[PDB]
Scaffold this active site. Sequence first.
Site, PDB file in Angstrom:
ATOM      1  N   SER A 242      30.505  41.045  40.146  1.00  0.00           N
ATOM      2  CA  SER A 242      30.913  39.962  39.241  1.00  0.00           C
ATOM      3  C   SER A 242      30.304  40.091  37.823  1.00  0.00           C
ATOM      4  O   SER A 242      31.040  39.942  36.846  1.00  0.00           O
ATOM      5  CB  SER A 242      30.526  38.623  39.844  1.00  0.00           C
ATOM      6  OG  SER A 242      31.354  38.389  40.966  1.00  0.00           O
ATOM      7  N   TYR A 245      31.715  41.926  34.431  1.00  0.00           N
ATOM      8  CA  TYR A 245      32.690  41.206  33.601  1.00  0.00           C
ATOM      9  C   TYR A 245      32.031  40.225  32.608  1.00  0.00           C
ATOM     10  O   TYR A 245      32.688  39.712  31.687  1.00  0.00           O
ATOM     11  CB  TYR A 245      33.656  40.448  34.525  1.00  0.00           C
ATOM     12  CG  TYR A 245      34.383  41.378  35.469  1.00  0.00           C
ATOM     13  CD1 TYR A 245      35.504  42.091  35.051  1.00  0.00           C
ATOM     14  CD2 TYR A 245      33.911  41.597  36.762  1.00  0.00           C
ATOM     15  CE1 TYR A 245      36.153  42.980  35.902  1.00  0.00           C
ATOM     16  CE2 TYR A 245      34.555  42.484  37.625  1.00  0.00           C
ATOM     17  CZ  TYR A 245      35.687  43.163  37.196  1.00  0.00           C
ATOM     18  OH  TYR A 245      36.343  44.030  38.045  1.00  0.00           O
ATOM     19  N   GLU A 334      35.997  42.637  47.417  1.00  0.00           N
ATOM     20  CA  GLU A 334      36.790  41.803  46.513  1.00  0.00           C
ATOM     21  C   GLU A 334      37.578  40.805  47.368  1.00  0.00           C
ATOM     22  O   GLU A 334      38.309  41.225  48.278  1.00  0.00           O
ATOM     23  CB  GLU A 334      37.714  42.665  45.635  1.00  0.00           C
ATOM     24  CG  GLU A 334      36.956  43.516  44.624  1.00  0.00           C
ATOM     25  CD  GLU A 334      37.749  44.425  43.706  1.00  0.00           C
ATOM     26  OE1 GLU A 334      38.934  44.131  43.425  1.00  0.00           O
ATOM     27  OE2 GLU A 334      37.157  45.417  43.225  1.00  0.00           O
TER      28      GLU A 334
HETATM   29  C1  LIG Z   1      36.866  36.424  30.628  1.00  0.00           C
HETATM   30  O1  LIG Z   1      36.997  36.329  32.058  1.00  0.00           O
HETATM   31  C2  LIG Z   1      37.023  37.607  32.552  1.00  0.00           C
HETATM   32  O2  LIG Z   1      35.996  38.360  32.522  1.00  0.00           O
HETATM   33  C3  LIG Z   1      38.350  38.195  33.173  1.00  0.00           C
HETATM   34  C4  LIG Z   1      39.874  37.990  32.989  1.00  0.00           C
HETATM   35  C5  LIG Z   1      40.098  36.715  32.900  1.00  0.00           C
HETATM   36  C6  LIG Z   1      40.232  35.902  34.006  1.00  0.00           C
HETATM   37  C7  LIG Z   1      40.420  34.548  33.812  1.00  0.00           C
HETATM   38  C8  LIG Z   1      40.518  34.026  32.518  1.00  0.00           C
HETATM   39  C9  LIG Z   1      40.400  34.861  31.432  1.00  0.00           C
HETATM   40  C10 LIG Z   1      40.177  36.217  31.634  1.00  0.00           C
HETATM   41  N1  LIG Z   1      38.111  38.293  34.577  1.00  0.00           N
HETATM   42  C11 LIG Z   1      37.700  37.351  35.413  1.00  0.00           C
HETATM   43  O3  LIG Z   1      37.431  36.174  35.234  1.00  0.00           O
HETATM   44  C12 LIG Z   1      37.562  37.813  36.749  1.00  0.00           C
HETATM   45  C13 LIG Z   1      36.533  38.860  36.616  1.00  0.00           C
HETATM   46  C14 LIG Z   1      36.172  39.130  37.814  1.00  0.00           C
HETATM   47  N2  LIG Z   1      36.904  40.085  38.407  1.00  0.00           N
HETATM   48  C15 LIG Z   1      36.525  40.423  39.618  1.00  0.00           C
HETATM   49  C16 LIG Z   1      37.249  41.427  40.211  1.00  0.00           C
HETATM   50  C17 LIG Z   1      36.871  41.833  41.482  1.00  0.00           C
HETATM   51  C18 LIG Z   1      35.789  41.258  42.145  1.00  0.00           C
HETATM   52  C19 LIG Z   1      35.102  40.235  41.535  1.00  0.00           C
HETATM   53  C20 LIG Z   1      35.424  39.805  40.285  1.00  0.00           C
HETATM   54  C21 LIG Z   1      34.672  38.773  39.665  1.00  0.00           C
HETATM   55  O4  LIG Z   1      33.729  38.169  40.189  1.00  0.00           O
HETATM   56  N3  LIG Z   1      35.050  38.437  38.382  1.00  0.00           N
END
Ligand SMILES: COC(=O)[C@H](Cc1ccccc1)NC(=O)CCc1nc2ccccc2c(=O)[nH]1
Length: 352
Positions: A242, A245, A334
């Site tokens: 997590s 990101y 995941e």
């Molecule tokens: C700015 O927020 C982010 O970092 C992006 C894309 C995103 C998602 C939602 C809103 C805006 C953007 N991603 C996520 O929120 C999810 C990231 C994430 N991806 C995963 C993929 C596989 C396993 C776990 C995760 C996780 O905990 N977070």
Amino acid sequence: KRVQPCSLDPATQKLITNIFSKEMFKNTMALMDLDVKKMPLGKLSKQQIARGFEALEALEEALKDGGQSLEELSSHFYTVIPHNFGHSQPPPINSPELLQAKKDMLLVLADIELAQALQAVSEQEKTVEEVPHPLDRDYQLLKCQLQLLDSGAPEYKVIQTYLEQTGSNHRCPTLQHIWKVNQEGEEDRFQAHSKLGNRKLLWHGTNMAVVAAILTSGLRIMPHSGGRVGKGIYFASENSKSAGYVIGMKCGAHHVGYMFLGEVALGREHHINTDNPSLKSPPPGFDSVIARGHTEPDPTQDTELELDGQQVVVPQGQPVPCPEFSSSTFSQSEYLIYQESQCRLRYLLEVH
Ligand SMILES: COC(=O)[C@H](Cc1ccccc1)NC(=O)CCc1nc2ccccc2c(=O)[nH]1
């Protein structure tokens, strides 16, 4: 117009300052290689993002003729969404990977814009002769309750271990604060899934410019969203996965990062060891798809919690090899849910 005193504590003042900072959203846009001098925070509109996504919709059809080229249709996306490339020719989007990369950049901008539109001054606030402290106004704007917890809480030593044991061995995120989250409107949708068990408190990492949107809307299945296992909400049982990101923002000698802890109601889970981007829901009779990893926190060191009269499994142990999934295409697990209603946020963490 009398400015009222700040009722929030220093920790909640920092949180609100950070997640609502114009410099923070402008810096998040700079890192996504966007031209903030040609696309300013206040000029950023729902029409421009719709157009941007419309330009990516045309590109998606070119990869999958007789029409325009991949260099001609990319050029329009860059004319809509301006990037800073040091005044040089922009590159064409020529792969499903780049297509979803440029899709995930617009999904952040949508939350950057959301938070901006959220901060608009209503005429009720205009006809009123007194204003709240800016921090207290932004806190009221989220329509979310954040409760800062201390050492002497039943769930503080539970989350502390969770973060330590499943967090990256060398690059350990230093915990600072824990806020007990209660989103008003997200209560009833999750309450409907009472019939559905297999409750697990799972991580969720994001960059600082989408935190407020999640504190106002919850975790969503956005049109044009996806990845390795489809159009669902992504959760990791290991903190390291997590935290990748979570772009750390510089603040003196320290780094600021905010992490979520959602309550995931999985039910009958369908496991997998291969990537399937084409997913939109799980197979029938199942309520969640889990991409099983090479490592997993040993389910023998697990603990539980009683969140609103329900038992939520909390993994406390270090990752351990998984021979049933020794050949899986995913190094870490995941967890995918394909309906927003199956999640409810439980905690917001401050990590350094
Ligand atoms: C700015 O927020 C982010 O970092 C992006 C894309 C995103 C998602 C939602 C809103 C805006 C953007 N991603 C996520 O929120 C999810 C990231 C994430 N991806 C995963 C993929 C596989 C396993 C776990 C995760 C996780 O905990 N977070």
